[PDB]
Structure formats: C-alpha cells, structure tokens
C-alpha cells in the first residue's frame, strides 16, 4: 500500500480489592494485529498473533516481554499518581490507555509519529506532531508535562519513533509481505428493500477488502447525501478482510436518481453503482 503504520496500544484497568490492575497490550501493522500481552494469561509472555511475527528470534520474544512487563509496572504506578493528581479515592476503578507508533510511506521513509495517553477515556498528554513538545489536556497533565520537559522525554520518544519503530515496521512488511502488502479491492453490489408503498431502502455493499480504509457514499442527482445516509462502521469479517455498507431511504420510483460511490486503494478506478434490477 502507499503508506503503512505500526501501532502499539495498552490498557490498564485498576481492580480495587481484587489485586493488581488488568493490563492488556496489542500491536498492529496497518489493520493486522501481530502481538498481544495479557496480565491475566498464564504464560506472562508476549505472544504472536500473526504468522509472520514468528520469524523473529528467541531474543526478540525475551526482550519484548521484558519491556512490556516493565511498561505494565509503569502504568500501575501512573494509575496511583493519577489518583493523587485528581484527588480520587482508592475504592474506584480507573482506566489508563497508551498508544504509540509511526507511519512510513511506500518509499520506506518516516511520515509521522505518535505517543499519547488517556485517563478514564479522556486525553491526558500527547506528543505533538513535530515530536518536540507535549499537548497536556488539563491541570494534572501540566504537572506531568513539566517533568517530561525536564527529563527530555520527547527527544527519547522522537528517536525511537524515527529509528527503531521505522526499522521494525520495514522488517515486518518484508517478512509478512505476501499478506501485509495486499490491497484487495471490495466486491460490491446493491440490494433493494421495500419499506412501505411510499419508500424503499437501497443498500450498497463492500465486502472482502483490505486494508480497512474505505469511503462509501450515496449521491442523489450528483449531490452528496451525507445528511441522510445510514453508514455502518467498517467491520471485520474474521478472515483478514473487512465489510461495510451504506443505505439510503428512497421514495418509490426514484431509485435511478441515486448512485453509490466506492473508493478504496485496491480499486484501479473509483466505482459508481446504480440500482439495476
């Protein structure tokens, strides 16, 4: 594909009275998950979730396991610090999420890096696009930003994101080339569903595509119907492909005013579908 991403995600959920926080982390290349770690699991190891990552040597699994375990300890500590910053009690359950990663173009060059945190589902602190400073969302996050500024955390993160992160993404794209580099276009069709004697539903289907990014839109007489389209979230089929549909409610006999438009990287040309019984 024309660009690629690697993303790591972690979630820590405190469990007051029930032991240490639950910690779940996953890594993705584009829309393909390839590793996980779950503090509840017996192995206490990072585990493969895509076949091509098993090409990595035993040192990889040892080193990554140590780093992910160390991160779970840091986030255990950070949940405690957050309670103090927000003056919250030890009785409630709270959530700390983190995401980092990089985007590279098809020429293999770094495009963008990310490093951010959310507490209880709200932005806490994030590395800005130039990777030189922080966006801190509230009063508590300014305390963190200050400390991170004095410790030069941004320079450490920038160096990882432009270096090791890019190197790892390029290696994974090589080892998993046969599956990771595909751009399988959607198979498309349209269905028609009478609602009453006055109205019917036209539904436009996109099936079997990868990667997940896609645009499905309805037009009436050449005009976007964004204000009237039922558009479901892109959803996994379970076999490595994705699905999506878009629907419009249509007055009886006016079906030919409407066209469905499909854009996907796997398509040579954008598609235009009409109801053609």
């Amino acid at each position: 594909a024309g660009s690629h991403s690697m993303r790591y995600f972690s979630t820590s959920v405190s469990r007051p009275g029930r032991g240490e926080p639950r910690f779940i982390a996953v890594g993705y290349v584009d829309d393909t998950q390839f590793v996980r770690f779950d503090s509840d699991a017996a192995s206490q190891r990072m585990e493969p979730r895509a076949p091509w990552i098993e090409q990595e040597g035993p040192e990889y699994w040892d080193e990554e396991t140590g780093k992910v375990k160390a991160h779970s300890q840091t986030d255990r500590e950070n949940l405690r610090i957050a309670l103090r910053y927000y003056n919250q009690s030890e009785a409630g359950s709270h959530t700390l999420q983190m995401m980092f990663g990089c985007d590279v173009g098809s020429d293999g060059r770094f495009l963008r890096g990310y490093h951010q945190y959310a507490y209880d589902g709200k932005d806490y602190i994030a590395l800005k696009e130039d990777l030189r400073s922080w966006t801190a969302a509230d009063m508590a996050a300014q305390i963190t930003k200050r400390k991170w500024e004095a410790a030069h955390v941004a320079e450490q993160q920038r160096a990882y994101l432009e270096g090791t992160c890019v190197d790892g993404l390029r290696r994974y794209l090589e080892n998993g080339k046969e599956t990771l580099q595909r751009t399988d276009p959607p198979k498309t069709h349209m269905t028609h569903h009478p609602i009453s004697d006055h109205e019917a539903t036209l539904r436009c289907w996109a099936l079997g595509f990868y990667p997940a990014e896609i645009t499905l839109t309805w037009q009436r007489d050449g005009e976007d119907q964004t204000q009237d389209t039922e558009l479901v979230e892109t959803r996994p089929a379970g076999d490595g492909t994705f699905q999506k549909w878009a629907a419009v409610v249509v007055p009886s006999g006016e079906e030919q005013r409407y066209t469905c438009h499909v854009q996907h990287e796997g398509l040579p040309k954008p598609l235009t579908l009409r109801w053609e019984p």
């Binding site: 160390a70 840091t74 500590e77 950070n78 610090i81 957050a82 963190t144 400390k147 991170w148 410790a151």
Partner: peptide, 4 residues
Amino acid sequence: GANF
C-alpha cells in the same frame, strides 16, 4: 517508561 516515564512516570506521571
């Protein structure tokens, strides 16, 4: 790696 970094604490809050």
